[PDB]
Amino acid sequence: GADIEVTTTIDEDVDNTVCSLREAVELINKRNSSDSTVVASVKDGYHGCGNKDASSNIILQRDKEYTLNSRITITAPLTISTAKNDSVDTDQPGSHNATIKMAGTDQLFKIDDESVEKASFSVLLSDLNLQGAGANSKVLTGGLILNHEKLTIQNSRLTGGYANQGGVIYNQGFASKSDRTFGFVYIVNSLIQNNKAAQGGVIYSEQPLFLITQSVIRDNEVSNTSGSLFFSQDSFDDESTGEYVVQRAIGLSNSTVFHNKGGFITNVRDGMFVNNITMIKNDKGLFLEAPQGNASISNSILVGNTINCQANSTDKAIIQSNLVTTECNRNASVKVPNILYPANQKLIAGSTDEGVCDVASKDGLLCPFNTPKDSFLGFFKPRLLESYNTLADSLIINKGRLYSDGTSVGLASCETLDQRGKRRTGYDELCDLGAIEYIG
Amino acid sequence: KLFGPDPYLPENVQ
């Protein structure tokens, strides 16, 4: 039909009338091949997979678990998503997503054109459950995906990513030179859970080439206590890192990060940004190594961790308008200061970090983590502890604001949306610290 | 606006 519709849940490569996920990808690979003998071999489909429109969209059915016995190499631009039409669409979002699970010890995908100079293509993975080999993983690099192209993952679950480097994704590629073959990873509205690596617990990127937004990062580990979940191997060769940070294209935003183990969450280099995240109840938080001063951490909650922040002796990262302890207040601007966390201030309004919220508790900034029925990702809900006359003394609510200044002040500007996609400054002029805008 | 055009990446990344 219009799209390539997979008609089986088993990993097959047999010429017949049933189309598998592997044969669907290989159809798009052979279609984009340079050998006309290969392109002509798929002029009428491949081993059961086909579509009249001849686009590169692979459709998986809802609530189906698709099994892979080994990785699949993607060498052409394509999309893999779950069926859209409900065929009554009032269920919990994220449910009815197709599942791509590993039946052996290998990774799920490798995304690379296998050639030099050939500019990077694009790949979209939407509304999927990517489940790796977990403790059975023999993957060295990229427990779920080994990426060398421009990859965009949305509305997905990323679990089971076990490797030595890059639990979920090993992002390969260098961007500082004239090489456009780099890999970029953009993850939005997703759940990163139960992933482990010796370095790069979630993403191992050779350069700061990732952007995580509106996502939830929980229960992940990097075994090296000096490593990070979102690791950047090398830094940019002064490729105007100040230009990289004003665009806010590399880093973490509108994301809840908690219950992660081992090393830091990420190593902040020049060109990266952190805005409107809630980073609580982790082993280690942010490691700061921005020698040129072209990095911004703003509007975030950076408390409740065993080590909230740690810095290299030559770091000049800008920390503005955050709820931090003393060790993360690098003061930065006087016009955009940070909000220091009061000693002995209760953080969670409950007996656990996840569960029911003591809605009668006069103290406690955040409710315990909870996933609402109308949403796919949970969060720590902010609570109003101050009166209207004393709202200026609140540690979270109405403490951020849009600046649009162009200098260091603009780096502390609010995010337009929050983790749930709600507009922070649509109906007002201020925003609330953390990943969630206070709505009630 | 940064790493090149793309159908799925955000504008500030492009």
Side-chain angles (χ1 to χ4, degrees), chain A residues 384-398:
Chain A
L384 177 62
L385 307 183
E386 304 292 333
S387 162
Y388 290 152
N389 281 333
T390 67
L391 216 166
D393 298 352
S394 178
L395 303 171
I396 290 180
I397 300 178
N398 288 346

Side-chain angles (χ1 to χ4, degrees), chain A residues 76-124:
Chain A
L78 52 82
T79 67
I80 306 179
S81 65
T82 317
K84 165 184 57 60
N85 290 320
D86 55 78
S87 68
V88 191
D89 219 335
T90 51
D91 305 333
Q92 179 169 3
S95 61
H96 313 303
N97 281 13
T99 296
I100 306 179
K101 96 163 190 176
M102 179 69 197
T105 68
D106 198 4
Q107 56 196 175
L108 293 185
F109 298 103
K110 180 193 178 183
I111 313 183
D112 194 357
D113 45 12
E114 311 280 4
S115 184
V116 185
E117 294 189 9
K118 172 64 69 61
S120 58
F121 56 85
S122 303
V123 171
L124 175 59

Side-chain angles (χ1 to χ4, degrees), chain A residues 79 122 124 150 152 182 184 186 209 211 244 247-249, chain B:
Chain A
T79 67
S122 303
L124 175 59
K150 300 198 265 70
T152 295
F182 53 57
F184 194 89
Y186 169 57
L209 308 166
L211 173 57
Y244 286 171
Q247 291 292 340
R248 288 177 168 176
Chain B
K1 301 178 181 181
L2 194 149
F3 281 145
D6 186 290
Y8 324 119
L9 292 173
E11 280 268 24
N12 57 320
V13 182
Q14 295 183 39

Side-chain angles (χ1 to χ4, degrees), chain A residues 288-349:
Chain A
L288 309 181
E289 43 174 353
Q292 288 157 29
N294 297 325
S296 173
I297 300 96
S298 56
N299 304 315
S300 299
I301 301 174
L302 315 175
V303 296
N305 313 274
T306 303
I307 295 181
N308 298 319
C309 61
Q310 187 173 333
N312 158 80
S313 54
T314 66
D315 169 71
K316 301 96 190 180
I318 303 154
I319 288 82
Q320 291 175 122
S321 172
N322 297 280
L323 180 59
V324 299
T325 51
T326 305
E327 80 254 26
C328 310
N329 179 33
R330 330 300 287 288
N331 308 313
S333 145
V334 193
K335 193 259 164 296
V336 193
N338 294 278
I339 293 90
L340 284 172
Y341 193 87
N344 291 335
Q345 167 63 57
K346 189 196 299 177
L347 183 64
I348 301 297

Side-chain angles (χ1 to χ4, degrees), chain A residues 151-166:
Chain A
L151 173 60
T152 295
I153 304 174
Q154 67 181 24
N155 304 341
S156 301
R157 291 182 179 91
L158 307 177
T159 64
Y162 284 45
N164 286 335
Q165 294 84 27

Side-chain angles (χ1 to χ4, degrees), chain A residues 150-303:
Chain A
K150 300 198 265 70
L151 173 60
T152 295
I153 304 174
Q154 67 181 24
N155 304 341
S156 301
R157 291 182 179 91
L158 307 177
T159 64
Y162 284 45
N164 286 335
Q165 294 84 27
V168 176
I169 292 176
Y170 185 105
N171 191 44
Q172 192 177 356
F174 282 110
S176 294
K177 45 222 179 189
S178 58
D179 196 16
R180 320 221 186 97
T181 52
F182 53 57
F184 194 89
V185 172
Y186 169 57
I187 302 180
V188 49
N189 195 38
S190 299
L191 165 70
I192 295 95
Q193 191 176 21
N194 184 223
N195 306 282
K196 179 180 191 163
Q199 178 62 271
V202 175
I203 297 180
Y204 188 110
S205 184
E206 295 160 355
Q207 282 188 320
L209 308 166
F210 55 89
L211 173 57
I212 315 298
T213 179
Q214 303 177 19
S215 307
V216 172
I217 299 93
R218 58 176 301 175
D219 304 322
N220 306 281
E221 171 186 341
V222 43
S223 303
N224 197 270
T225 64
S226 298
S228 302
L229 298 184
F230 301 87
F231 180 68
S232 298
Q233 186 185 286
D234 301 349
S235 70
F236 292 114
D237 283 57
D238 300 8
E239 305 288 329
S240 296
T241 48
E243 288 283 336
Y244 286 171
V245 71
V246 282
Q247 291 292 340
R248 288 177 168 176
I250 316 170
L252 292 65
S253 69
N254 283 328
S255 303
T256 297
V257 185
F258 76 106
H259 285 190
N260 298 280
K261 301 307 162 185
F264 300 91
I265 300 307
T266 183
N267 51 325
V268 184
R269 300 191 184 275
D270 284 313
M272 283 157 70
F273 89 101
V274 172
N275 198 19
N276 279 119
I277 78 165
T278 299
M279 186 181 67
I280 67 177
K281 299 292 187 174
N282 300 277
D283 280 355
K284 296 181 179 181
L286 303 178
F287 183 75
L288 309 181
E289 43 174 353
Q292 288 157 29
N294 297 325
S296 173
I297 300 96
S298 56
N299 304 315
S300 299
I301 301 174
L302 315 175
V303 296

